[PDB]
């Protein structure tokens, strides 16, 4: 409980302070400041991009990692009374790593796109470079979070399948279909991230 | 079996003292039916080998008896809903005859769509018309049995809901174009004057100013049918329905303390008739009489030309209780109104100590004298 | 004149019900309830209508209409 | 008159013991009466009419049993007319039989 | 919505106004119900 | 003349007048219904009397509707900002007072129904107790009217 | 079906025919209260009132036809309430 | 004339109208469906009646859709900022009021299904309580329609 | 001339006076309602004494209303920013002091009622304890008048 409440306090306080500021700069007519335009323009497109690339990997890796130990823990625990589980049910781990694969694929593809502008004025940087930095962030975020959720789901359902096998071997083959429906979400994340990436150029 | 079970159950309420030959029992009855029970006792002896007629004496040192009221098809529900909040004290004023209209009236003010008034009327009518059938049908539809036991009261409130829906001039978002109007035809917005504003009104929304000569004047029906279609109608309707509810509530409260005085007179108690009604009615009347007068006064004293910079009713009420009229922002309604506001609240506040303390002090003096 | 006549009509209608009721009503326990029904009906129904008509007198603002309605109310009434 | 709560009285009855069964039946048919309880000690075996009530309870159970057996046979109960009580004598024993 | 639920709503709202806001001026609502002990309850 | 954002506080008033009132009425309903459902198991008859808290939850959403409509009908692009803050104050004052009312109606509308199931005599008490919850929404409405019409 | 549905069909038949024929009348008399209800278009602020009158007649027929369908629901329901 | 940013609020209104209504209708469905499943094992015959809360949660999703569609069809490339705020308010005011009705239908639907299973007489009373939940969504729709069309 | 935002803090005053007082009155009523309802079953005669904490929670909402009215009746578009902060102060002062009084009244008006049925002599003690609760709302009112009138 307590360690969550400390974080929750920071979270609520953060939004409460934004509401105070949002009212303040509105009512004092200072609302010409904090125009989202300068934030989304004076930020470097390379920042957005590299966060995107790193998200694409790391969130996929988190989804896959949860994926792995969630099923693995069950493989081991059922495996004590049913050693047969380990060889076949390991395909869930393979699909969790496939969510990581989807990460590294999309990340490497994104990583080819960025190049230096030799510019610092927003007009000399120009629309293509901003649009690329944002699109790359979007793609990397899309695949990353989609894979994050995909891998956790695959780990959960694959754990279930492993504990089904522990009671009857035939259940594994039948139940395994749900790991596809899990894995597909990560592929959909890839597909969208490709399309978000598909028009980009930098420099 | 039912009759025997009930008889022997009731017989277990009797008593036998150490010297006693008979049984002994006591009953409450209506004073009208003290004869009826004596005839039943005489018959009860005659329906047996016994000769002694089992007669009674009236008891004198009585506790407060169980409370009763007679009922019929039109009054059964009204008494049950009174009893549902609680059974009255003996000889107390009965709310139920006032409730027979008052509850239906407030319901109809609430439920005042003309078409819904008809549909509820129809439902209650189909229950009354089918009464001889329905009394023999399934008891298991308890929902239908409950509303059937309300059928006559539901009908009465249905009728009043028609009447309110008529004054509100609305069935299902529809109004009676059978009527004339205080609104005026488009040519009247174009008398050389206002025609320029009607050319703007030939591209965008416009408000009728209700100016004389253009306006169709005072109106003899309920609400003007045009307020069904007008975009500002809800503002007009709200100004009305608030002010209505206030006056109606005030009147029912003043009737409640009048019923209190009548109850105090029925018990014939000099303290209750004095220290109850007098301070309560004066407190309420001094606030509410002025408020209702102001509500009706504005509709007489103000009109279209005065509308721009017209005062607020609620402010002239608030600044009575608070005195706090800031010599500004609202026009005063009549000469000496500031003095009237001060006087009325002072007169009401001067009533409170009599209820708060002087009645208690007389009760304390009575307990000290009863020694 | 023309506003006061409707008031007199509705005032007289509810008042005359309260007046005539006791003459029309019979003896016995139903009497006082039936008469009280007429009396309270006249009071409440008169007052509710009286407020509505008095509130309809001297309108401080007139109806607001849309452009489309303003054109059509020229011919359809 | 219904503008106020109605007038009532308490009375004390020289209830003859052999009249009492019929007296109660006539007073229950009249219905316009409420008995005061003069027996605060009343309980299943402490009451004055233990056997008569316990007989009525068993007779109700036997009635419920036979009624259910006729209902189980899908036969309608006849359901017509109104009937008086049994008189004061123990003719309820023929109903038990 | 209207004929059923807002009807029952209005019914109960006005009933409540009766039970306290009106009745509390004058009606004590404390006592014992007179019960007609009768064969009517069969 | 008047600020562009001026209507924002007005419409957030109108929304708030509803939203918080609906949250109040929702909680009030939800709690009461849960109690009613639970009690009805041994009480097939009390149901129709037991719904009373639920209706008292409903009127809170209506008090919100009154103010929300009043504000909405008095919005315009040209609104004087001062009118918009009046309307915001109104919409919060009914909205959150209705929320508070809904909390009290909920807890009362659970416990009172349970107590009435255990002891029918509680009913009158529960009525009175529930009035002192629902009146919060009314006080919210009173000030919200004063503000919106000032 | 059942008798409950037939009883509802009787009520909606009567109420429907009443309101729908009254609408058919208010539309055929071209009543001004119906301006917000008629499906007018920009082309009805041209030629003259004959354009809106053609629409008022068509909508008057809609309500008359719907009332005819509610008469059929009535006749059906008055059979079903006896048959079920 | 108008700010190019300004359609953002009306769009957040169109989104909110759906999203918060969906969160509501989802929660109401989810709670009720759990209840139906946990009831059915004992009383399968009740399913065809005890489904009603889910249908009412569906109504909330519709109230969202109505306003969301209405806002979206009312948007324009240069929208008046005042109209954009009206749409935001419509969007929240249905959207969150639908959330509140979704909470209410959820809690009542789950508890009221268990209650019905344990006492079938409850079902007729439960419907009243469920309408008193679902109407909060409708009051939110009333205001949202008013704001969008004002 | 005075800053046009200045009326914002004034309406935040009137709202806070009402809202927080309603939150206090709600929690005071809710806890008291649970208490009275849970208690009633063992000693039903105690309800008409045991309502009194609820009345006190009602009085807290009245103290909020008195301030919220007085603020609202005093506002104007031209309001000097000084007076607007006074009104915010008054609003928070009564409102949160009422919330405080409502927390006390709730906890006391629960536990004291549940004690009172076990031991009736507690009742006078519970009243005395509650005086020292309800007075917090009065101190909030006292400060709120002293602020908002000067």
Curated annotation (Swiss-Prot), chain C:
It holds the Pfam family ATP_synt_H. Its main location: membrane. It comes from the Eukaryota. Glycans are attached at residue 67. GO terms for cellular component: clathrin-coated vesicle membrane; synaptic vesicle membrane; vacuolar proton-transporting V-type ATPase, V0 domain. The chain crosses the membrane at residues 5-25, 33-53. It is a multi-pass membrane protein. Expressed in brain (at protein level). Keywords: Cytoplasmic vesicle, Glycoprotein, Hydrogen ion transport, Ion transport, Membrane, Synapse, Transmembrane, Transmembrane helix, Transport. Residues 54-77 are lumenal. The keyword Metal-binding does not apply. It is found in: Membrane; Cytoplasmic vesicle, Clathrin-coated vesicle membrane; Cytoplasmic vesicle, Secretory vesicle, Synaptic vesicle membrane. Residues 26-32 are cytoplasmic. One of its GO terms (biological process) is synaptic vesicle lumen acidification. GO terms for molecular function: proton-transporting ATPase activity, rotational mechanism. The keyword Transmembrane helix applies. Disulfide bonds: none annotated. V-ATPase is a heteromultimeric enzyme made up of two complexes: the ATP-hydrolytic V1 complex and the proton translocation V0 complex. The V1 complex consists of three catalytic AB heterodimers that form a heterohexamer, three peripheral stalks each consisting of EG heterodimers, one central rotor including subunits D and F, and the regulatory subunits C and H. The proton translocation complex V0 consists of the proton transport subunit a, a ring of proteolipid subunits c9c'', rotary subunit d, subunits e and f, and the accessory subunits ATP6AP1/Ac45 and ATP6AP2/PRR. Subunit of the V0 complex of vacuolar(H+)-ATPase (V-ATPase), a multisubunit enzyme composed of a peripheral complex (V1) that hydrolyzes ATP and a membrane integral complex (V0) that translocates protons. V-ATPase is responsible for acidifying and maintaining the pH of intracellular compartments and in some cell types, is targeted to the plasma membrane, where it is responsible for acidifying the extracellular environment. Belongs to the V-ATPase e1/e2 subunit family. It comes from Rattus norvegicus.
Swiss-Prot record, chain D:
It is found in: Cytoplasmic vesicle, Clathrin-coated vesicle membrane; Cytoplasmic vesicle, Secretory vesicle, Synaptic vesicle membrane; Melanosome. It comes from the Eukaryota. V-ATPase is a heteromultimeric enzyme made up of two complexes: the ATP-hydrolytic V1 complex and the proton translocation V0 complex. The V1 complex consists of three catalytic AB heterodimers that form a heterohexamer, three peripheral stalks each consisting of EG heterodimers, one central rotor including subunits D and F, and the regulatory subunits C and H. The proton translocation complex V0 consists of the proton transport subunit a, a ring of proteolipid subunits c9c'', rotary subunit d, subunits e and f, and the accessory subunits ATP6AP1/Ac45 and ATP6AP2/PRR. Interacts with SPAAR. Belongs to the V-ATPase 116 kDa subunit family. Subunit of the V0 complex of vacuolar(H+)-ATPase (V-ATPase), a multisubunit enzyme composed of a peripheral complex (V1) that hydrolyzes ATP and a membrane integral complex (V0) that translocates protons. V-ATPase is responsible for the acidification of various organelles, such as lysosomes, endosomes, the trans-Golgi network, and secretory granules, including synaptic vesicles. In certain cell types, can be exported to the plasma membrane, where it is involved in the acidification of the extracellular environment. Required for assembly and activity of the vacuolar ATPase. This is V-type proton ATPase 116 kDa subunit a 1. The lineage of its organism: Eukaryota, Metazoa, Chordata, Craniata, Vertebrata. The chain holds residues 3 to 99 of 838 of the full protein.
Swiss-Prot record, chains F, H, I:
It is a multi-pass membrane protein. InterPro entries: ATPase_proteolipid_c-like_dom, ATPase_proteolipid_csu, ATPase_proteolipid_su_C_euk, F/V-ATP_Csub_sf. It is found in: Cytoplasmic vesicle, Clathrin-coated vesicle membrane; Cytoplasmic vesicle, Secretory vesicle, Synaptic vesicle membrane. SUPFAM superfamilies: F1F0 ATP synthase subunit C (SSF81333). Ubiquitinated by RNF182, leading to its degradation via the ubiquitin-proteasome pathway. One of its GO terms (molecular function) is ubiquitin protein ligase binding. The record marks 134 as: Essential for proton translocation. GO terms for cellular component: clathrin-coated vesicle membrane; membrane; proton-transporting V-type ATPase complex; synaptic vesicle; synaptic vesicle membrane; vacuolar proton-transporting V-type ATPase, V0 domain. Residues 29-50, 110-126 are cytoplasmic. GO terms for biological process: negative regulation of autophagic cell death; positive regulation of ERK1 and ERK2 cascade; positive regulation of Wnt signaling pathway; synaptic vesicle lumen acidification. It holds the Pfam family ATP-synt_C. Expressed in brain (at protein level). Keywords: Cytoplasmic vesicle, Hydrogen ion transport, Ion transport, Membrane, Synapse, Transmembrane, Transmembrane helix, Transport, Ubl conjugation. It comes from the Eukaryota. The chain crosses the membrane at residues 6-28, 51-71, 88-109, 127-147. Residues 72-87, 148-150 are lumenal. Belongs to the V-ATPase proteolipid subunit family. V-ATPase is a heteromultimeric enzyme made up of two complexes: the ATP-hydrolytic V1 complex and the proton translocation V0 complex. The V1 complex consists of three catalytic AB heterodimers that form a heterohexamer, three peripheral stalks each consisting of EG heterodimers, one central rotor including subunits D and F, and the regulatory subunits C and H. The proton translocation complex V0 consists of the proton transport subunit a, a ring of proteolipid subunits c9c'', rotary subunit d, subunits e and f, and the accessory subunits ATP6AP1/Ac45 and ATP6AP2/PRR. The gene is Atp6v0c.
């Amino acid at each position: 409980t307590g360690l969550e409440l400390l974080y929750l306090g920071i979270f609520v306080a953060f939004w409460a302070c934004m509401i105070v500021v949002g009212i303040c700069y509105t009512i004092f007519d200072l609302g010409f400041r904090f125009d989202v335009a300068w934030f989304l323009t004076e930020t470097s497109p390379f920042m957005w991009s590299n966060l995107g690339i790193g998200l694409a990997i790391s969130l996929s890796v988190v989804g896959a990692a949860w994926g792995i130990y969630i099923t693995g823990s069950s493989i081991i625990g059922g495996g004590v009374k049913a050693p047969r589980i380990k060889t076949k049910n390991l395909v869930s781990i393979i699909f969790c790593e496939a969510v990581a694969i989807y990460g590294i694929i999309m990340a490497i593809v994104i990583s080819n796109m960025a190049e230096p502008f030799s510019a610092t004025d927003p007009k000399a940087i120009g629309h293509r470079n901003y649009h690329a930095g944002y699109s790359m962030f979007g793609a990397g975020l899309t695949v990353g979070l989609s894979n994050l959720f995909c891998g956790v789901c695959v780990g959960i359902v694959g754990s279930g399948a492993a504990l089904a096998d522990a009671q009857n071997p035939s259940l594994f083959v039948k139940i395994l279909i749900v790991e596809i429906f899990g894995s597909a979400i990560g592929l959909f994340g890839v597909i969208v991230a490709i399309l978000q990436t598909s028009r980009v150029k930098m420099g | 079996v039912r009759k025997m079970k009930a008889i022997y159950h009731t017989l277990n309420l009797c008593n036998i003292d150490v010297t006693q030959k008979c049984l002994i029992a006591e009953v409450w009855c209506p004073v009208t039916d003290l004869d009826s029970i004596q005839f039943a006792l005489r018959r009860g002896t005659e329906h047996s080998g016994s000769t002694v007629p089992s007669i009674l004496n009236r008891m004198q040192t009585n506790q407060t008896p169980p409370t009763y009221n007679k009922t019929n098809k039109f009054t059964h529900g009204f008494q049950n809903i009174v009893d549902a909040y609680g059974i009255g004290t003996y000889r107390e004023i009965n709310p139920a005859p006032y409730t027979v209209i008052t509850f239906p009236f407030l319901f109809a003010v609430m439920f005042g769509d003309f078409g819904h008034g008809i549909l509820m009327t129809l439902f209650a009518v189909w229950m009354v018309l089918r009464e001889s059938r329905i009394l023999s049908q399934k008891n298991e539809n308890e929902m239908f049995s409950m509303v059937f036991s309300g059928r006559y009261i539901i009908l009465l409130m249905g009728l009043f809901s028609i009447y309110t829906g008529l004054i509100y001039n609305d069935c299902f978002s529809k109004s009676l174009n059978i009527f004339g109007s205080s609104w005026s035809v488009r040519p009247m917005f174009t008398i050389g004057n206002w025609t320029e504003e009607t050319l703007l009104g030939s591209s965008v929304l416009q408000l009728n100013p209700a100016i004389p000569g253009v306006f169709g004047g005072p109106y003899p029906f309920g609400i003007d049918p045009i307020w069904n279609i007008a975009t500002n109608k809800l503002t007009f309707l709200n100004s009305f329905k608030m002010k209505m509810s206030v006056i109606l509530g005030i009147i029912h409260m003043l009737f409640g303390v009048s019923l209190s005085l009548f109850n105090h007179i029925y018990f014939k108690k000099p303290l209750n008739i004095y220290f109850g009604f007098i301070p309560e009615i004066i407190f309420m009347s001094s606030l509410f009489g002025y408020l209702v007068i102001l509500i009706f006064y504005k509709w007489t004293a103000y009109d279209a030309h005065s509308s721009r910079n017209a005062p607020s009713l609620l402010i002239h009420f608030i600044n009575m209780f608070l005195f706090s009229y800031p010599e500004s922002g609202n026009a005063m309604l009549y000469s000496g109104q500031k003095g009237i506001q001060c006087f009325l609240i002072v007169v009401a506040m001067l009533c409170v100590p009599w209820m708060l303390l002087f009645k208690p002090l007389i009760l304390r003096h009575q307990y000290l004298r009863k020694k | 004149h023309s506003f006061a006549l409707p008031v007199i009509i509705f005032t007289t209608f509810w008042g005359l019900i309260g007046i005539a009721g006791p003459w029309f009503v019979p003896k016995g326990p139903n009497r006082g309830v039936i008469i009280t029904m007429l009396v309270a009906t006249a009071v409440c129904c008169y007052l509710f209508w009286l407020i509505a008509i008095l509130a309809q007198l001297n309108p401080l603002f007139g109806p607001q209409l849309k452009n489309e309605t303003i054109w059509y109310v020229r011919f359809l009434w | 008159e219904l503008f106020r709560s109605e007038e009532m009285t308490l009375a004390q009855l020289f209830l003859q013991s052999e009249a009492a069964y019929c007296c109660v039946s006539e007073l229950e048919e009249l219905g316009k009466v409420q008995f005061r309880d003069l027996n605060p000690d009343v309980n299943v075996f402490q009451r004055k009419f233990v056997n008569e009530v316990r007989r009525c309870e068993e007779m109700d159970r036997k009635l419920r049993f036979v009624e259910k057996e006729i209902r189980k046979a899908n036969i309608p109960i006849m359901d017509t007319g109104e009937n008086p009580e049994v008189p004061f004598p123990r003719d309820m024993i023929d109903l038990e039989a | 919505i209207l004929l059923i639920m807002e009807g029952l709503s209005a019914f109960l709202h006005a009933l409540r106004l009766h039970w306290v806001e009106f009745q509390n001026k004058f009606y004590t609502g404390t006592g014992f119900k007179f019960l007609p002990f009768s064969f009517e309850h069969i | 003349n008047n600020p562009e954002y001026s209507s924002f506080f007005g419409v957030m008033g109108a929304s708030s007048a509803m939203v918080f009132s609906a949250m109040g009425a929702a909680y009030g309903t939800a709690k009461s219904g849960t109690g009613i459902a639970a009690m009805s198991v041994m009480r097939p008859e009390l149901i129709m009397k037991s719904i009373i808290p639920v209706v008292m939850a409903g009127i809170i959403a209506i008090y919100g509707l009154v103010v929300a409509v009043l504000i909405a009908n008095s919005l315009t692009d040209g609104i004087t900002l001062y009118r918009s803050f009046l309307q915001l104050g109104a919409g919060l004052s009914v909205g959150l007072s209705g929320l508070a009312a809904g909390f009290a109606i909920g807890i009362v509308g659970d416990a009172g129904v349970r107590g009435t199931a255990q002891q029918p005599r509680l009913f009158v008490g529960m009525i009175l107790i529930l009035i002192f919850a629902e009146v919060l929404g009314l006080y919210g409405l009173i000030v919200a009217l004063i503000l919106s019409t000032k | 079906c059942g008798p409950k549905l037939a009883a509802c069909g009787i009520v909606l038949s009567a109420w429907g025919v009443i309101m729908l024929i009254m609408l058919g009348i208010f539309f055929n008399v071209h009543s001004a209260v119906l301006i917000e209800d008629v499906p007018f278009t920009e082309k009805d602020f041209e030629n003259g009132p004959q354009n809106i009158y053609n629409l008022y007649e068509q909508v008057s027929y809609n309500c008359f036809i719907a009332a005819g369908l509610y008469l059929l629901l009535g006749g059906f329901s008055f059979c079903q309430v006896r048959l079920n």
